[PDB]
Amino acid sequence: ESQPRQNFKVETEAGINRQINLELYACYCYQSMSFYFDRDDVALPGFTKYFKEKSDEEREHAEKFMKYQNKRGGRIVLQDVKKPDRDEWGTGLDAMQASLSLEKNVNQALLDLHTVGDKEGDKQFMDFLESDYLEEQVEDIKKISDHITNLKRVGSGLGEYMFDKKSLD
Amino acid sequence: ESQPRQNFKVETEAGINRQINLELYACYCYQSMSFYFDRDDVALPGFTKYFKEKSDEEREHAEKFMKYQNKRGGRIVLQDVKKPDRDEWGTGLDAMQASLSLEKNVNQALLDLHTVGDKEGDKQFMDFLESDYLEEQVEDIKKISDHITNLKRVGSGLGEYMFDKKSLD
Amino acid sequence: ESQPRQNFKVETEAGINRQINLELYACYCYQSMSFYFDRDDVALPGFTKYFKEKSDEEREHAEKFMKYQNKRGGRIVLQDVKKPDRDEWGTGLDAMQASLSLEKNVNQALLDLHTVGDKEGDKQFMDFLESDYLEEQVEDIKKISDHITNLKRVGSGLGEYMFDKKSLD
Amino acid sequence: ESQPRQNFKVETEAGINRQINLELYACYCYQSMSFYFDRDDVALPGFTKYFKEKSDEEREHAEKFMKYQNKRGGRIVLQDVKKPDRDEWGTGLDAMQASLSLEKNVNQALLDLHTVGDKEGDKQFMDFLESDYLEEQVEDIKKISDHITNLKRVGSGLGEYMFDKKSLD
Ligand SMILES: [Fe+3]
Ligand SMILES: [Fe+3]
Ligand SMILES: [Fe+3]
Ligand SMILES: [Fe+3]
Ligand SMILES: [Fe+3]
Ligand SMILES: [Fe+3]
Secondary structure, three states: OOOOOOOOOHHHHHHHHHHHHHHHHHHHHHHHHHHHHOOOOOOOHHHHHHHHHHHHHHHHHHHHHHHHHHHHOOOOOOOOEOOOOOOOOOOHHHHHHHHHHHHHHHHHHHHHHHHHHHHOOOHHHHHHHHHHHHHHHHHHHHHHHHHHHHHHHHOOOHHHHHHHHHOOO | OOOOOOOOOHHHHHHHHHHHHHHHHHHHHHHHHHHHHOOOOOOOHHHHHHHHHHHHHHHHHHHHHHHHHHHHOOOOOOOOOOOOOOOOOOOHHHHHHHHHHHHHHHHHHHHHHHHHHHHOOOHHHHHHHHHHHHHHHHHHHHHHHHHHHHHHHHOOOHHHHHHHHHOOO | OOOOOOOOOHHHHHHHHHHHHHHHHHHHHHHHHHHHHOOOOOOOHHHHHHHHHHHHHHHHHHHHHHHHHHHHOOOOOOOOEOOOOOOOOOOHHHHHHHHHHHHHHHHHHHHHHHHHHHHOOOHHHHHHHHHHHHHHHHHHHHHHHHHHHHHHHHOOOHHHHHHHHHOOO | OOOOOOOOOHHHHHHHHHHHHHHHHHHHHHHHHHHHHOOOOOOOHHHHHHHHHHHHHHHHHHHHHHHHHHHHOOOOOOOOOOOOOOOOOOOHHHHHHHHHHHHHHHHHHHHHHHHHHHHOOOHHHHHHHHHHHHHHHHHHHHHHHHHHHHHHHHOOOHHHHHHHHHOOO
8 A cells, every 4th residue: 555545545546537527528629629729710719819819728727636636645647638529519509518518528427436436435535525626616617508599699690799799708 | 242142032032023013012902991991971980090000911921022122132122003993892891892902912912932942942932921921911800801891780770880999909 | 521621631630639638647646656755654755746847848748739739720630638547657767768658659759649639741840849849859859868867876775865856847 | 411412422432532642742752852963963944843743743643533533522541651762763764764664654543533523424424534634644744754765865974064054845
């Protein structure tokens, strides 16, 4: 057993390694999204910047889980990060809805990972998940929902152009 | 032979003199475009400013080639700069598309001028073209393409007015 | 053909997409390396920081290629990024030698990608590769070689500990 | 019942009083360790400073539990704080390993105290323990493990001397 390991179960360790891969996958999706909106036939610089920032956030999420794995005495096992499931992301509305669905899937995986910690009695891990992940997911999912509502409100064309300027920095 | 001349062929020298005239011609077109959008029945001050800045850029391009001609020991031979091929430039979309076509023609002339340098073994001239012209053309052509996409996105009327305010300074 | 596309061949476009995946793969390897040295039974914070910075550099390399693909009018096609070929990276000397081998493989892929640009006459792309990638690879490969020499000089134990403090920030 | 008492069980109150004594005991051990390394025949000033700071931390831990006991309406009952179980702490490696074992014992007592809060439904007390104690224990246990690894890496003699200078302030 590694020196720090205490109240840290193998199932919790394995759950963290699957979550690392999922956060890396989300980071990859957002990176794809960002450079899609940098296409010359898409050309929405607010969307480009917004998904780039979201991509860096997911990379931070993954690395924080890596750091935590080490803190508790687990061992990081990396896997292929799959390519995103689309090459092209439609309109700003489509991308924002794909992003909502993505964040809700990450949130469910996090809640399932909380359930592993809870049944194993990992008090510290539950609070770590709560403080550093669950609250952020809830804020993010609310923010993206608002954006979807406004992208429906403004419509295509000028509306989408104006949303890019006024709702995304 | 002039004092500095070394590894500098007469065909390269002549190519630079044709390119000088082309850059001057581009400068003239952009100047025409700029004051077209300053017409009282057009009246788009973002477009006016944007094409004025682009005109000064092309003037700089020409003068840099003049300076280089002298650096290598060639002799500048100037020609008439023809009047632009339109007096009137349509909508903001039309002007932006005329500008894309213009920049692509300058880029092709630059690539052909690179080919002259390459076959003559003008190592320094190729790098000069690469560093000081080819990269800028690629950035510019990408920027103008983005603008064309957004001018189609926003449509005529209010859209064109909003693009003038939000995409051009 | 996309609006900006000019002197940009399909083989060059495909080469950039393979290089994107390779830079992402290098970023993943360095990220693995970094958190390996953050293990409690490895615990070298200079190595951790050094490979984290190297990981961010490779991510920048990938994104710059993504941006360039868009600049020229190509289309980004992403693939799975494979997991690194080791879970554990040995001593500081082993990791530094794995890193040298990695950078030399990236450098060879870049030189092969230069060869594609050259035979297709992509003057701008060659200079882009030269200025923004080839020079950095040469500096990096020299830096890592120096580190390997010093890690052999200092030996294991105290030597490796001292190198972590004095050669890596 | 005291004025503030609400959802605060007698078993939870008693658990806090045992934890107070344990934190005081840890503070005493670290104080012993610190002045051991201030011995003229030991003379490691980094270790001296490090364990002094750790001693003050444990004193803060105890006093925070005292303050909390009062916040909830419990009553502090103090006991003898036993003398540490060694007068002499060996090498820097020995002391660091004794410290790891100490922190893991405090962590287990904290987790057992969390279990008392959980079964009694003391929602606020669990979060207090999580936020103010469990996270710190996990960081500390990871830090001490790293130090043990490096103290094995550097070896005795010059290694131990260098660790005192470079890993402890
Ligand atoms: Fe997110
Ligand atoms: Fe909590
Ligand atoms: Fe231009
Ligand atoms: Fe060059
Ligand atoms: Fe590198
Ligand atoms: Fe402690």
